[PDB]
Amino acid sequence: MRSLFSDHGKYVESFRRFLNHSTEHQCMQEFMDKKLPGIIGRIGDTKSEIKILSIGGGAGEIDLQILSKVQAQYPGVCINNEVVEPSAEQIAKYKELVAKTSNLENVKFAWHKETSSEYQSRMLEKKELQKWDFIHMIQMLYYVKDIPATLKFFHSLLGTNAKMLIIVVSGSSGWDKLWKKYGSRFPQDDLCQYITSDDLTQMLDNLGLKYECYDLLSTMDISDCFIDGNENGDLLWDFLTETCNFNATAPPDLRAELGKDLQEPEFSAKKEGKVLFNNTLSFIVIEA
Numbered sequence: 001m002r003s004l005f006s007d008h009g010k011y012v013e014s015f016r017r018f019l020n021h022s023t024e025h026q027c028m029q030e031f032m033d034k035k036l037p038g039i040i041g042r043i044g045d046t047k048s049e050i051k052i053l054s055i056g057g058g059a060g061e062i063d064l065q066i067l068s069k070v071q072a073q074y075p076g077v078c079i080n081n082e083v084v085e086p087s088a089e090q091i092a093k094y095k096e097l098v099a100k101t102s103n104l105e106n107v108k109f110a111w112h113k114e115t116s117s118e119y120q121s122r123m124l125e126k127k128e129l130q131k132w133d134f135i136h137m138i139q140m141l142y143y144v145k146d147i148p149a150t151l152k153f154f155h156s157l158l159g160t161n162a163k164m165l166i167i168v169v170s171g172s173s174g175w176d177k178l179w180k181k182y183g184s185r186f187p188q189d190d191l192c193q194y195i196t197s198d199d200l201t202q203m204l205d206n207l208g209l210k211y212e213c214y215d216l217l218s219t220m221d222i223s224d225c226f227i228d229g230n231e232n233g234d235l236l237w238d239f240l241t242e243t244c245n246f247n248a249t250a251p252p253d254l255r256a257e258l259g260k261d262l263q264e265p266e267f268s269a270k271k272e273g274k275v276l277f278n279n280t281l282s283f284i285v286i287e288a
């Protein structure tokens, strides 16, 4: 069993199938529309330049949406948005998106090709420490080695009335169950790392930071995962298991318990003849 994250090709295909059969993206859309406003309501107060640091170039369309809400609250104010992404493929895509978008004259972009870690290391070399008004980490901690250290660092980069926003899958979610129980039995990679909003609050508690957590429901239609032979079904399987060609490369003893175990409540809910996997999300905001 080889980690799915080691086959850039498969991954994407799957990831893509994941978005196509989930309310993930719309879920964040709702957060940004009905909650974000009041959250970032004062990060611009008294500043003639609003700085926004985004760690991860995977949700370009979401980043842009954040800008939309920040511009609305602070008309005229120029915005400096830096992006810290390791994947050239991503940055590349991001950029394309920028060029095709309007109402971004009062925004300055700057992409840095590296990891949160590398970025962080560098900064320390600099003598001066630079602050920020808004930091955010959408679905990417999974790929961070030192969470506690990472959290504390960027918190210190927050300026006055600044805020840091983090998104991960919720403790009360299918993923949680899927990992607490089966994890050990899946390919242990050094790149990925199973983490839930739960692991998060404990770390933040022990760190002593003041945060606020919000959960919203999101689903993943895994119906094609019971139709033996279905191509689509196969990809999805690859995703949950974060493994390559899961079926044809895993112990049926296991693939047997899952097939059963997934169609159960604590993992999924049965709807319009559909089997919906609990993809609930958590949004954490941290004060400076």
Ligand SMILES: Nc1c2c(nc3ccccc13)CCCC2
Pocket (backbone or CB within 6 Å): 024, 058, 138, 139, 140, 142, 169, 175
């Ligand atoms: N829903 C997601 C999960 C992971 N990464 C993701 C990356 C961005 C979009 C959603 C994601 C890793 C493990 C589990 C779930």
